């Protein structure tokens, strides 16, 4: 169970190129299930029902009171 369950914010909008990638939009919230190689991270949408791959250089890990 390699999952961290860390939320993240969408800094910029991104579109998937494969049939296994997830879409992203500036201001959109996502949950990074776990980091993956190739510079791709598996995250899910807000609905929590849609999961896929998202860019790491396009999102920003959110924290409760840390930086």
């Amino acid at each position: 169970m390699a999952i961290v369950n860390q939320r993240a914010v969408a800094l910029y909008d991104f579109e998937p190129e494969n049939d296994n990638e997830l879409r992203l939009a500036e201001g959109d919230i996502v949950f990074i299930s776990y980091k993956h190689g190739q510079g791709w991270l598996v995250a899910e949408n807000e609905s929590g029902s849609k999961t896929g791959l998202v860019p790491e250089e396009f999102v920003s890990y959110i924290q409760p009171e840390l930086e």
Partner: peptide, 16 residues
């Protein structure tokens, strides 16, 4: 695993 990306991730803009 289910997902399997095979390509270089994009890059952010310069403005922001």
């Amino acid at each position: 695993g289910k997902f399997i990306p095979s390509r270089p991730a994009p890059k952010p803009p310069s403005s922001a």
